Design a protein around this ligand. Structure first.
Ligand SMILES: [Zn+2]
Ligand SMILES: [Zn+2]
Lengths: 111, 52, 113
């Protein structure tokens, strides 16, 4: 996550002080400068799993084309649920199922 | 090597191309102005063990 | 023979169901040089092909010598084993571009599934 300038809404690029030895987020369109909280400047994931379970909506139980199972809900122990596979559509994607209860509407696995 | 499976697997491993990107999983950039110490707590023990 | 063919096809469908469950619980063996989805598709296709071959072999063994289709196939003048299998026992799996029927709709082949 990256922060924005509080006065002109531009991006806050990180900057390093030679004399003070501190990491600071500074806007290049002004003189505003705010002290950085964490040193994690950049992170790149070669193999990522985000978007696998992130594709979830709160009204997925109203879809009539989705199959319905009788798996046990971990939270409220309901007897009706709706399952589907991974929303990510790469070639390496697993065939595991995500179950959605019809009362608490949370996503849970079978393992 | 043709009638032994282990030597064949050794040859196969020695022939196949393997880059850093294959074994790498994630790369990160951190700010740390102390050459002899570090800010990260998980790796602090290992790096101080190295320096000592 | 029709009972035997029905039993063979039902056993194959149960086997395919078991393969589906194993692939959906990460218990499936991966063929080297191929992904999980490709290995699953190849194994299901192999099972269904073996099912059609077994049903056809049962049907072709049933036939008498006076059977006319058998006489034509045995003379070598017209027809083969696959024709007898498809006419009498099972048409089998339909392949488009060397793969099973794709999901032309949103995650299904027809709006009836
Ligand atoms: Zn600014
Ligand atoms: Zn529930």
């Amino acid at each position: 996550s990256f922060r924005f300038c509080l006065e002109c809404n531009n991006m806050l690029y990180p900057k390093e002080d030679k004399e003070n030895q501190r990491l600071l987020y500074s806007c290049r369109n002004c003189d505003y400068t705010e002290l950085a909280e964490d040193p994690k400047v950049y992170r790149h994931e070669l193999i990522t799993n985000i978007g696998e379970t992130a594709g979830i909506v709160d009204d997925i139980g109203q879809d009539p084309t989705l199959p319905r199972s009788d798996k046990e809900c971990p939270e409220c122990h309901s007897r009706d649920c709706v399952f589907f596979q991974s929303q990510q559509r790469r070639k390496d994607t697993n065939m595991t199922l995500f179950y959605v209860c019809l009362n608490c509407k949370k996503t849970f696995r079978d393992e | 090597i043709a009638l032994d499976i282990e030597k064949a697997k050794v040859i196969q491993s020695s022939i196949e191309y393997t880059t850093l990107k294959n074994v790498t999983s994630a790369t990160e950039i951190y700010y740390d102005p102390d050459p002899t110490s570090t800010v990260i707590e998980e790796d602090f023990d290992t790096v101080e063990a190295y320096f000592s | 023979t029709m009972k035997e063919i029905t039993h063979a096809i039902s056993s194959a469908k149960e086997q395919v169901q078991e393969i589906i469950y194993k692939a959906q619980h990460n218990e499936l063996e991966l063929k080297p040089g191929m992904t999980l989805r490709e290995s699953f598709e190849g194994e299901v296709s192999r099972t269904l092909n073996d099912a059609r071959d077994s049903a056809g072999r049962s049907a072709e063994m049933n036939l008498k010598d006076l059977n006319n289709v058998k006489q034509m196939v045995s003379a070598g003048s017209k027809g083969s084993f696959i024709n007898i299998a498809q006419m009498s026992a099972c048409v089998g799996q339909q392949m488009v571009e060397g793969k099973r029927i794709a999901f032309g709709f949103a995650d299904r082949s027809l709006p009836h599934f």
